[PDB]
């Protein structure tokens, strides 16, 4: 029957014998345990060691396995993904389905995981009441047997499947057999851009309920205009035999204080001509001046639902955390508790580099702490309902959640082929309805989402209206079909740009500013995805935040995304390395496109995270004379755990510093008057830095946490006093092949055939391993490469235009190389043409001026042909002989910063170990740049000017040629890149040109100047 | 004190090279102890007669962004025509040059002055690579205006009919020039991308004889 029916190839069957969905249950038999959320003896975990056997297809599974253990089976930890145990490969594909697109059919070679468990059930559990099993996550479909007898079937990998085991269990030893299919018709709705894995990957448990039971309960909170009064409404449903003596009590608790309580017999109000629900009751509780829930202040109450007898005997209790909050769209603005939200959001997949898609409390808490520490207030469940604990933590720590149905059909042609098909409505409906039934009582959930990237079909409209009808308390959003369809309350585009239109046919992405004011448009706009953080990315992030703050109806967005989906592999010595698509023999695959995070898989931050933190700051600053104006962007809280630290420095040298406590109302302003600042003796630029410090620890941060900062230039005093004339005079030695300049134990050698400084000598020691040459290219970033699907190439991608123009092949040709003797200096003058196939791309004209102080002044003037693609950089590079421990610089830092991602960086004196000047992106590229640098120090060397630099043991060439960070080898000496100019990194998306015009090197002619001396 | 600031000499040297003479200068403009601008130049006169002027300017970050960064002088010559390769034919400024076209333009001197009834800076042409006036040729990438009226006379005169042609021709050659604005005329209206806020500036000119 099971083999004959092939339920995993029928979108009409998504389950057999599955119980109704409901909010989290524990079936407490003690009300105090329910109130305090203590463990329940009636809820038992079946996690731990199970037996497992892998088969190529369900037809290969031997019938004996139903009755007893396969000796060939292994013992494995559950929950798990079986790919993480090496039974078969995980597959990384983005859009293209990992199976032949032939709905509803799946491949006959369908990897089958056979799980089994021998466990004890006590007689007391079977003598009375109902024993159910709960599978919180099984990917992608499964049949269940208990003691040899078929129980049921379930689909949807991301929501719990529950089965009554009461009639299948016996006292003592029992055995479960779970046959998990990798592919099913459910897979057609599970095409999320992530690793394709499978197995029993979330918790398994047993729940005992009495026959007469709470089967469902819903909590609503309604308010008066100023939120000074609330009504808590709790609808409760029962199963079992109705009796006149039955009662329901709902009590509300604030800490250990009961604030309200209501008791009633079962029997609802009349709803129609046939009467009402005899098996339901609605309790209403008045709450005066409730403490309101928000991400700022996650005030929670506890609601306890008791089913009992009139004379006071408890039958069972259930409970949940209650957050008093209202979510509504009014006059085009998303309001929370009557105030317009500014969504500082991120998309977060459930990903672990070791455990695959198995989630644990520790990883969840770590993510929430890092998010809040980095000024995020919201998370999107991309693209499926999460592990139930996630919502509990978001309720308690305070994050706004978009809960999203497990529906994505990206790979269909066209995208709505299934979602417009009424045959797939039943399957889709269960993924929406069962999510709502499970999660509707969580205060952290503020928006429902119909799924991701499934076009726009009539099925979406139907399910949109279903949610609006059963839950008016939360807006519904959905991006598919152009982000502004009739199935969405919020305009929610992905990767719409700030100012630039992208007018794609049928599904255009307008400038977000333009989108708001399209004829007839009234809704708020919140990007469901923006600022694709793939590798060296997040260029232009500040442009989004400037716009969010200026336009009321631009209420923010969710960054894509939180954590890199890299997986751990091991080399021959057991050393771990980060792997991506294609590294598991998985084919076809989309390579590094699974890595888009602000953080590495182990939660180490990318440089981009600090840019996100800074732009998402909750305090804004302005400087007028001696006055700092601090504006609060909080909606509810006073700044009761904040102090402002100010510092004035002169080219990195502290001059004055102080601190003022912040006392700012939400949305309010505070003026801080700086004291008279003492005039500095020396020449240079004075800088003001302010930072907001949290003196006290919180649930989410340590004491001394910095939450905001900002810098301004103050007075500058230009250096007019000339250096005292050095007595020494350098000597020029000319030969046919070289111009040599000597000054004591110092030599500079200029090759006359090439026109470059080919060597420098301090005594008898070489300083250079490679000549100092011009460089106009970079090891391409993920954004430069611009590939979202390994097959497709965009001829407009920067890397493509650079390659086609011959930028990486360009050969320097010497035009001019002359030497002159001045009164107190030697002057070398060079000119080079960079050419590809007859065409001149760049001309570099230089002067090197070497004086008696041993300083080499380099002047560079570059012409770039207007019809060549704008170059990635205009600079010089060399391989230094020296390998030193520290890099010291005056400029923007401390972290990696690029022209379109430097707002978070502060100007100061920074000192780091060499290794910190390299960012270990899993896919290697140009990295570690620091901008706005006036002075750089490394070993014996000093460079001065106004430049950008990176410094490391890896050449651009190695970075360009190496696909994985772990394959990089330290080269001899240190590679230095010093740029007068560097192109933006982009990131608005990572699959088309995304570098804004103001950050492209389009000026045609460029000038920069450097002084190289010995420190 | 931008209108009051006087040049103070810091450096002025000369060096004889293989086929050229090199003059190196440095100046500071100051107002009441404050250094507003620093100008560093090299003049390179070679055996062909061409004088290459390389100019590098520093502008104090805390002084109001300057209206222009360039050079001026009063030529002895009064010529009939002005011939340039650049944007024209009409007056154009950095934030008002979209109408102008790049080409070879030849106008009488009088067309290089705009007779605004209230006299001001006027007649600028931007994006110029070559300027010809009598025997003189300037090459580079600059903005220029040329007329019989000095910036000072324009500044001191309230009506165009009271202007008098000065001896010779005033030439202003700018490496950089501030936008003119006009979103309104009663508040600062020049957009940030057209303000001279970069701090450090570079331009080069080649002066020779036709
Ligand atoms: O990492 C990408 C991220 O963005 C979302 O869209 C994916 C992207 O895929 C490309 O192949 C298409 O050309 C483009 O239309 C589309 O934006 C997606 O919602 C995320 O889950 C994730 O794939
Ligand atoms: Mg099915
Ligand atoms: Mg997708
Ligand atoms: Mg615990
Ligand atoms: Mg034009
Ligand atoms: Na806004
Ligand atoms: Na991706
Ligand atoms: Na405070
Ligand atoms: Na690479
Ligand atoms: Na005037």
Curated annotation (Swiss-Prot), chain A:
Coiled coil: none annotated. One of its GO terms (cellular component) is beta-galactosidase complex. GO terms for biological process: lactose catabolic process. Binds 2 magnesium ions per monomer. Can also use manganese. The active site is at 453 (proton donor), 529 (nucleophile). Changing residue 789 to A/L: The catalytic efficiency is not increased, when the sodium concentration increases. Induction: By allolactose. Its cofactor is Mg(2+); Mn(2+); Na(+). It catalyses: Hydrolysis of terminal non-reducing beta-D-galactose residues in beta-D-galactosides. Na(+) binds at residues 193, 593, 596. Inhibited by phenylethyl thio-beta-D-galactoside (PETG), isopropyl thio-beta-D-galactoside (IPTG), L-ribose, D-galactonolactone, lactose and 2-amino-D-galactose. The keyword Magnesium applies. The record marks 349, 383 as: Transition state stabilizer. Mg(2+) 2 binds at residue 589. Changing residue 991 to F/G/L/T: Decreases affinity for substrate. The keyword Hydrolase applies. Substrate binds at residues 94, 193, 453, 529-532, 596, 991. It comes from the Bacteria. Keywords: Glycosidase, Hydrolase, Magnesium, Manganese, Metal-binding, Sodium. It holds the Pfam family Glyco_hydro_2_N. PANTHER family: BETA-GALACTOSIDASE (PTHR46323:SF2). Belongs to the glycosyl hydrolase 2 family. Homotetramer. This is Beta-galactosidase.
């Amino acid at each position: 029957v099971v083999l004959q029916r092939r339920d995993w190839e029928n979108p009409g069957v998504t389950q057999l014998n599955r119980l109704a969905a409901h909010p989290p249950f524990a079936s407490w038999r003690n009300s105090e345990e329910a109130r305090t959320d203590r463990p329940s003896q009636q809820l038992r975990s079946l996690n731990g060691e199970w037996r497992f056997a892998w088969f190529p297809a369900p037809e290969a599974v031997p019938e004996s396995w139903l009755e007893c253990d396969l000796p060939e089976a292994d013992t494995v930890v559950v929950p798990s993904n079986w790919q993480m145990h090496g039974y078969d490969a995980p597959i990384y594909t983005n859009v293209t389905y990992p199976i032949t697109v032939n709905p509803p059919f799946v491949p006959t070679e369908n990897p089958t995981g056979c799980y089994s468990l021998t466990f004890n059930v006590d007689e007391s559990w079977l003598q009375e009441g109902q024993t159910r099993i709960i599978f919180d996550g099984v990917n992608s479909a499964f049949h269940l047997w208990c003691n040899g007898r078929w129980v049921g079937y379930g689909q949807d990998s991301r929501l719990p499947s529950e089965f009554d085991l009461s009639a299948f269990l016996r006292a003592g030893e029992n055995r479960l057999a779970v046959m998990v299919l990798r592919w099913s018709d459910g897979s057609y709705l599970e095409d999320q851009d992530m690793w394709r894995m499978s197995g029993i990957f979330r918790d398994v448990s047993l729940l005992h309920k009495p026959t007469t039971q709470i089967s469902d309960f819903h909590v609503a909170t309604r308010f008066n205009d100023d939120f000074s009064r609330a009504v808590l409404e709790a609808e409760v449903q029962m199963c079992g035999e109705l009796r006149d003596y039955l009662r329901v009590t709902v009590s509300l608790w604030q800490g250990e204080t009961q604030v309200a309580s209501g008791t009633a017999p079962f029997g609802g109000e009349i709803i129609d001509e046939r009467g009402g629900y005899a098996d339901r009751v609605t309790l209403r509780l008045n709450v005066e001046n409730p403490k309101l829930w928000s991400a700022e202040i996650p005030n929670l109450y506890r609601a306890v639902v008791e089913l009992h007898t009139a004379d006071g005997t408890l039958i069972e209790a259930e409970a949940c955390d209650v957050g008093f909050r209202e979510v509504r769209i009014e006059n085009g603005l998303l309001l929370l508790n009557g105030k317009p939200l500014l969504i500082r959001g991120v998309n977060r997949h459930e990903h672990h580099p070791l455990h695959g898609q198995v989630m644990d409390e520790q990883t969840m808490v770590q993510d929430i702490l890092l998010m809040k520490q980095n000024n995020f207030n919201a998370v999107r469940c991309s693209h499926y309902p999460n592990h139930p604990l996630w919502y509990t933590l978001c309720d308690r720590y305070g994050l706004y959640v978009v809960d999203e149905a497990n529906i994505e059909t990206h790979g269909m042609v066209p995208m709505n082929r299934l979602t417009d098909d009424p045959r797939w409505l039943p399957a889709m409906s269960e993924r929406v309805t069962r999510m709502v039934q499970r999660d509707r009582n969580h205060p952290s959930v503020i928006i429902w989402s119909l799924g991701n990237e499934s076009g726009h079909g009539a099925n979406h409209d139907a399910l949109y209206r279903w949610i609006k009808s059963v839950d008016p308390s939360r807006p519904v959003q959905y991006e598919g079909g152009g982000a502004d369809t009739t199935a969405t309350d919020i305009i929610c585009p992905m990767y719409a740009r700030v100012d630039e239109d992208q007018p794609f046919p049928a599904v255009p992405k307008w400038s977000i500013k333009k989108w708001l004011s399209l004829p007839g448009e009234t809704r708020p706009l919140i990007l469901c995805e923006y600022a694709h953080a793939m590798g060296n990315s997040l260029g232009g992030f500040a442009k989004y935040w400037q716009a969010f703050r200026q336009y009321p109806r631009l209420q923010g967005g969710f960054v894509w995304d939180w954590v890199d989906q890299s997986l751990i592999k091991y080399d021959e010595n057991g050393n771990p390395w980060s792997a991506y698509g294609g590294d598991f023999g998985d084919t076809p695959n989309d390579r590094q496109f699974c890595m888009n995070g602000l953080v590495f898989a182990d939660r180490t931050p990318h440089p981009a995270l600090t840019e996100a933190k800074h732009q998402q700051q909750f305090f804004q600053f302005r400087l007028s004379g001696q006055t700092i104006e601090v504006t609060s962007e909080y909606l509810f809280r006073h700044s009761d755990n904040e102090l402002l630290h100010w510092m004035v420095a002169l080219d990195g040298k502290p001059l004055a510093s102080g601190e003022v406590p912040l006392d700012v109302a939400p949305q309010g302003k505070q003026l801080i008057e700086l004291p008279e600042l003492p005039q500095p003796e020396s020449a240079g630029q004075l800088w003001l830095t302010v930072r907001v410090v949290q003196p006290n620890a919180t649930a989410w941060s340590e004491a001394g946490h910095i939450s905001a900062w900002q810098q301004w230039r103050l007075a500058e005093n230009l250096s007019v006093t000339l250096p005292a004339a050095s007595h020494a005079i350098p000597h020029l030695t000319t030969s046919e092949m070289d111009f040599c300049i000597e000054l004591g134990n110092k030599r500079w050698q200029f090759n006359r055939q090439s026109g470059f400084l080919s060597q420098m000598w301090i005594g008898d020691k070489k300083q250079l391993l490679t000549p100092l040459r011009d460089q106009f290219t970079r090891a391409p970033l993920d954004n430069d490469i611009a590939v979202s699907e390994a097959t497709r190439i965009d001829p407009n991608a920067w890397v493509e235009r650079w390659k086609a123009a011959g930028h990486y092949q360009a050969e320097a040709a010497l035009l001019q190389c002359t030497a002159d003797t001045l009164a107190d200096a030697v002057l070398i003058t060079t000119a080079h043409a960079w050419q590809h196939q007859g065409k001149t791309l760049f001309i570099s004209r230089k002067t090197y001026r070497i004086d008696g102080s041993g300083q080499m002044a380099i002047t560079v003037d570059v012409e770039v042909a207007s019809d060549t693609p704008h170059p990635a950089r205009i600079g010089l590079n060399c391989q230094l002989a020296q390998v030193a421990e520290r890099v010291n610089w005056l400029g923007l830092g401390p972290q990696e910063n690029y022209p379109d991602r430097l707002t978070a960086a502060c100007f100061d004196r920074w000192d780091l170990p060499l290794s910190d000047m390299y960012t270990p992106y899993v896919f290697p590229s140009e990295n570690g740049l620091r901008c706005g640098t006036r002075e750089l120090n490394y070993g014996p060397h000093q460079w001065r000017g106004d430049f950008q630099f990176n410094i490391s043991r890896y050449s651009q060439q190695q970075l360009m040629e190496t696909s994985h960070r772990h394959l990089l080898h330290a080269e001899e000496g240190t590679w230095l890149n010093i740029d007068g100019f560097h192109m933006g990194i982009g990131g608005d998306d990572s699959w088309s040109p995304s570098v804004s015009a103001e950050f492209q090197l389009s000026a045609g002619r460029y000038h920069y100047q450097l002084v190289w001396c010995q420190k």
